[PDB]
Design an enzyme around this catalytic site. Structure first.
Site, PDB file in Angstrom:
ATOM      1  N   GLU A  23      -5.566  -5.673  -4.589  1.00 15.73           N
ATOM      2  CA  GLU A  23      -6.090  -5.674  -3.199  1.00 15.73           C
ATOM      3  C   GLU A  23      -4.916  -5.526  -2.223  1.00 15.73           C
ATOM      4  OE1 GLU A  23      -9.899  -5.691  -2.622  1.00 15.73           O
ATOM      5  OE2 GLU A  23      -8.975  -4.746  -4.402  1.00 15.73           O
ATOM      6  N   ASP A 128       8.003 -10.915 -12.946  1.00 15.01           N
ATOM      7  CA  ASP A 128       7.511  -9.587 -13.398  1.00 15.01           C
ATOM      8  C   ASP A 128       8.435  -8.486 -12.875  1.00 15.01           C
ATOM      9  OD1 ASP A 128       6.105  -7.624 -14.650  1.00 15.01           O
ATOM     10  OD2 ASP A 128       4.183  -8.013 -13.622  1.00 15.01           O
ATOM     11  N   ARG A 132       7.481  -0.738 -12.291  1.00 12.64           N
ATOM     12  CA  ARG A 132       6.166  -0.705 -11.597  1.00 12.64           C
ATOM     13  C   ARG A 132       6.156  -1.667 -10.396  1.00 12.64           C
ATOM     14  NH1 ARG A 132       5.487  -3.266 -16.468  1.00 12.64           N
ATOM     15  NH2 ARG A 132       5.119  -5.504 -16.274  1.00 12.64           N
ATOM     16  N   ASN A 133       7.030  -2.681 -10.362  1.00 13.53           N
ATOM     17  CA  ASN A 133       7.087  -3.670  -9.255  1.00 13.53           C
ATOM     18  C   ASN A 133       8.324  -3.414  -8.398  1.00 13.53           C
ATOM     19  OD1 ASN A 133       4.624  -4.929 -10.006  1.00 13.53           O
ATOM     20  ND2 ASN A 133       5.693  -6.281 -11.441  1.00 13.53           N
ATOM     21  N   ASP A 146       8.015  -8.505  -3.983  1.00 17.45           N
ATOM     22  CA  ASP A 146       8.402  -9.944  -4.027  1.00 17.45           C
ATOM     23  C   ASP A 146       7.164 -10.840  -3.994  1.00 17.45           C
ATOM     24  OD1 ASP A 146       7.991  -9.079  -1.403  1.00 17.45           O
ATOM     25  OD2 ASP A 146      10.056  -9.544  -0.749  1.00 17.45           O
TER      26      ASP A 146
HETATM   27  C1  LIG Z   1       0.956   0.993  -4.695  1.00 16.26           C
HETATM   28  C2  LIG Z   1       1.588   1.749  -3.553  1.00 16.26           C
HETATM   29  N1  LIG Z   1       2.311   1.046  -2.673  1.00 16.26           N
HETATM   30  C3  LIG Z   1       2.894   1.718  -1.667  1.00 16.26           C
HETATM   31  N2  LIG Z   1       3.685   1.014  -0.746  1.00 16.26           N
HETATM   32  C4  LIG Z   1       3.721  -0.334  -0.608  1.00 16.26           C
HETATM   33  N3  LIG Z   1       4.432  -0.917   0.326  1.00 16.26           N
HETATM   34  C5  LIG Z   1       4.483  -2.253   0.078  1.00 16.26           C
HETATM   35  C6  LIG Z   1       3.632  -2.713  -0.871  1.00 16.26           C
HETATM   36  C7  LIG Z   1       3.348  -4.111  -1.234  1.00 16.26           C
HETATM   37  O1  LIG Z   1       2.774  -4.351  -2.282  1.00 16.26           O
HETATM   38  N4  LIG Z   1       3.748  -5.057  -0.347  1.00 16.26           N
HETATM   39  C8  LIG Z   1       3.544  -6.448  -0.479  1.00 16.26           C
HETATM   40  C9  LIG Z   1       2.493  -7.098   0.182  1.00 16.26           C
HETATM   41  C10 LIG Z   1       1.558  -6.375   1.111  1.00 16.26           C
HETATM   42  C11 LIG Z   1       2.332  -8.466  -0.043  1.00 16.26           C
HETATM   43  C12 LIG Z   1       3.188  -9.165  -0.875  1.00 16.26           C
HETATM   44  C13 LIG Z   1       4.217  -8.515  -1.519  1.00 16.26           C
HETATM   45  C14 LIG Z   1       4.386  -7.158  -1.319  1.00 16.26           C
HETATM   46 CL1  LIG Z   1       5.662  -6.305  -2.118  1.00 16.26          CL
HETATM   47  S1  LIG Z   1       2.812  -1.385  -1.643  1.00 16.26           S
HETATM   48  C15 LIG Z   1       2.759   3.098  -1.543  1.00 16.26           C
HETATM   49  C16 LIG Z   1       2.007   3.767  -2.521  1.00 16.26           C
HETATM   50  N5  LIG Z   1       1.756   5.105  -2.465  1.00 16.26           N
HETATM   51  C17 LIG Z   1       0.769   5.767  -3.296  1.00 16.26           C
HETATM   52  C18 LIG Z   1       1.366   7.016  -3.908  1.00 16.26           C
HETATM   53  N6  LIG Z   1       1.870   7.926  -2.867  1.00 16.26           N
HETATM   54  C19 LIG Z   1       2.404   9.163  -3.452  1.00 16.26           C
HETATM   55  C20 LIG Z   1       1.351  10.043  -4.103  1.00 16.26           C
HETATM   56  O2  LIG Z   1       1.939  11.022  -4.926  1.00 16.26           O
HETATM   57  C21 LIG Z   1       2.872   7.229  -2.052  1.00 16.26           C
HETATM   58  C22 LIG Z   1       2.284   5.986  -1.434  1.00 16.26           C
HETATM   59  N7  LIG Z   1       1.405   3.075  -3.500  1.00 16.26           N
END
Ligand SMILES: Cc1nc(Nc2ncc(C(=O)Nc3c(C)cccc3Cl)s2)cc(N2CCN(CCO)CC2)n1
Ligand SMILES: Cc1ccc(NC(=O)c2ccc(CN3CCN(C)CC3)cc2)cc1Nc1nccc(-c2cccnc2)n1
Length: 250
Positions: A23, A128, A132-133, A146
């Site tokens: 989510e 983890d 992937r992270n 984080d």
């Molecule tokens: C899974 C994913 N995340 C992306 N960027 C994120 N920014 C930070 C993230 C994150 O989780 N923050 C966070 C939060 C919110 C809470 C606690 C801790 C944390 Cl660390 S997720 C970009 C991305 N894209 C899909 C694929 N596209 C290319 C297609 O070819 C580029 C874009 N996909």
């Protein structure tokens, strides 16, 4: 609390990475029309708020920056900066290798080791640490995600002492880091390919380690092997790992 936001400060947009992070959504923080990432919860509340509190304490160029939280009543939000290119594993697997070449692999390794050196010094552990992270931004910027931090599992990334006795340390993260470095050096191959998850420990116990990837410099592979020392106190510090990467730059 200076981190607290009203949910209505955020406009929720599309789910990020087709749901790989669960989510986590793209959003807009209206105050600055700034694209952000938002993790939501509408079961695991105690866990979600403990992570929110941990992320308030962390500030490093290579850890994803907290911007705000909604922790009053559900749904609960953690709001961070938006990493534009997504997770490092997919990035390595799909990249142009003419661009993402030897010096970028070193740069990615060095950045992650910088983040982990900071966590080591601040008495945090990651539970983890894997490609992937990690998240990628412009110009090969890499930040460690984080949400899974603790103040002081993924079997193929898990140190032997953590599989056996459920004991985690910064030295367990050094083991995981060596697997992550292997992921970087193979442009994101699956570790221990075809090996049943129940037999990884017994192979490691009998001194089995993954072989040097094709084209992996010997000094880089030695550092992997140092990360995979059976005895946690024989593994180098993240400070030593970061310094070794700094030294490799010719
Ligand atoms: C899974 C994913 N995340 C992306 N960027 C994120 N920014 C930070 C993230 C994150 O989780 N923050 C966070 C939060 C919110 C809470 C606690 C801790 C944390 Cl660390 S997720 C970009 C991305 N894209 C899909 C694929 N596209 C290319 C297609 O070819 C580029 C874009 N996909
Ligand atoms: C840290 C790392 C880990 C793994 C790799 N691996 C590779 O660089 C590599 C090379 C060849 C292949 C195989 N490939 C198969 C396909 N055919 C077409 C091409 C070859 C795969 C990976 C590089 C690095 N980078 C690195 N390592 C050590 C030093 C440096 C470095 C670079 C520049 C200046 N100073 C230091 N850069």
């Amino acid at each position: 609390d200076k981190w607290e936001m009203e949910r209505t400060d955020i406009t929720m947009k599309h789910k990020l990475g087709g749901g790989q992070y669960g989510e986590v959504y793209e959003g807009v923080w209206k105050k600055y029309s700034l694209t952000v990432a938002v993790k939501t919860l509408k079961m695991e509340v105690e866990e979600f708020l403990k992570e929110a509190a941990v992320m308030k304490e962390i500030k490093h160029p290579n850890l994803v920056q907290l911007l705000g939280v909604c922790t009053r009543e559900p749904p609960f939000y953690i709001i961070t900066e938006f990493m534009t290119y997504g997770n490092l594993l997919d990035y390595l697997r799909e990249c142009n290798r003419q661009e993402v070449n030897a010096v970028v692999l070193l740069y990615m390794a060095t950045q992650i080791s910088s983040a982990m050196e900071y966590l080591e010094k601040k008495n945090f552990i990651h539970r983890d640490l894997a490609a992937r992270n990690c998240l990628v931004g412009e110009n090969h910027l890499v930040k460690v995600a984080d949400f899974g931090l603790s103040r002081l599992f993924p079997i193929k990334w898990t140190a032997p002492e953590s599989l056996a006795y459920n004991k985690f340390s910064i030295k367990s993260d050094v083991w995981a880091f060596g697997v992550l470095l292997w992921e970087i050096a193979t442009y994101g191959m699956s570790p221990y390919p075809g090996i049943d998850l129940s037999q990884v420990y017994e192979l490691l116990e009998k001194d089995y380690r993954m072989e040097r990837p094709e084209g992996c410099p010997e000094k880089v592979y030695e550092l992997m092997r140092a990360c995979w020392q059976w005895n946690p106190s024989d593994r180098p510090s993240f400070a030593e790992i970061h310094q070794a990467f700094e030294t490799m730059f010719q």
